[PDB]
Design a protein around this ligand. Sequence first.
Ligand SMILES: [Ca+2]
Ligand code: NI
Ligand code: NI
Ligand code: NI
Length: 220
Amino acid sequence: ELIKENMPMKLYMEGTVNNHHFKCTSEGEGKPYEGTQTMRIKVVEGGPLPFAFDILATSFMXGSRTFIKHPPGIPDFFKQSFPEGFTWERVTTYEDGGVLTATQDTSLQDGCLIYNVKVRGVNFPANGPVMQKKTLGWEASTETMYPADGGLEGACDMALKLVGGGHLICNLETTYRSKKPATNLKMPGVYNVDHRLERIKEADDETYVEQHEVAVARYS
Ligand SMILES: [Ca+2]
Ligand code: NI
Ligand code: NI
Ligand code: NI
């Protein structure tokens, strides 16, 4: 219907991480009913970024919620929200004190999903792995989804691989809000989304990135 078996995406992102401003654009496509997508991402202002691109990854199924495979038995808050669309607001808290806040608008225009993202990263240690570009991508994760007075909340711990073999742990708290009246939505129960966000290709300086995500919902 409005969400076809194949859907394209376009994105604009702007914000700051510590004292550095940047802008990104991306375009991609995916299979909403399979839970898969690919995004081709350009740093268009503020590049090369003096921090790990990994801290932005969930802002592009961590950020592209229409492409989560929901079995028919799990009401799909995101796909039900069209044509009106939805928003999300997240705080990602790293164990070393970095905090990445992101807010996002999702709309549907002429059969493309359109994302507008605002990023604010603060307090990343100057000599820590994010600002020193010592990260190696995200491990697979599970986000628990909680129906919340007409919205949906998500809660996830994620693990950022580090050069040396360790991990940097962070916590995600997200609020997902529909632009449809909640009374017009079927709310799901509590459920889980298993996510796999993978770096496919990059410019040496991370000013071009391709990343892939797979995301599939299940009842615990
Ligand atoms: Ca590991
Ligand atoms: Ni700005
Ligand atoms: Ni700078
Ligand atoms: Ni299928």
